[PDB]
């Protein structure tokens, strides 16, 4: 799934 736009991409996905 495409990363959450407004959120910092380095946090995604939840480990």
């Amino acid at each position: 799934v495409k990363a959450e736009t407004r959120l910092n991409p380095d946090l995604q996905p939840t480990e």
Partner: antibody
Amino acid sequence: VQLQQSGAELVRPGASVKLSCTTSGFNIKDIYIHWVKQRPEQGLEWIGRLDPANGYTKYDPKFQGKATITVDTSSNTAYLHLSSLTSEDTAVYYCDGYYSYYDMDYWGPGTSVTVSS
Amino acid sequence: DIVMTQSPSSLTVTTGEKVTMTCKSSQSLLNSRTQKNYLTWYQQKPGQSPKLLIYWASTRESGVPDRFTGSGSGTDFTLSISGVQAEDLAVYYCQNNYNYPLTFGAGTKLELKR
């Protein structure tokens, strides 16, 4: 345009409650769900987030022992479970769903919870 | 945890004037690789659900009026309204989208003077 949330809840002190959020119009596996709390006349408070890619949830440390977010992909419904309710839990709980394919943020109408005997 | 400080807490303005509110974070919200600041602004009208206005510190969501502008980088950010109208009456919130927890600021209440 707007997510569906369950109706108002009146629950007694010490009991628990489970609120729901149905993403009508979207496959819940493509939505980033967030739960936000707002006590009367106070500001917005972030509770946690559900990852659509694996089902894992992240929380604000202060809500860790009170809240639990789960999901039922078959019915497109996400849930917020609150345990051992006190008067500090009386608030409106909002369901926030971000659909990154449209770069759009969608909100539910909120569910009002009143903790009283 | 990153602390979000908004100011002023209350603001009274007259229709047509330029409004400016501030949101400061205790740590930088900048991602060096993407060169973007992950600060998000919301608007909440009385009795309604919040609505996202701007993300990435200065990018407006589709449909958001042109009079809403966001700027800033690092730890200092601002939201400006060019020619505030009667319907702009609401509470404005900024939120950390850089790292967990995604904390909200206390908000700035906007009231009109007549």
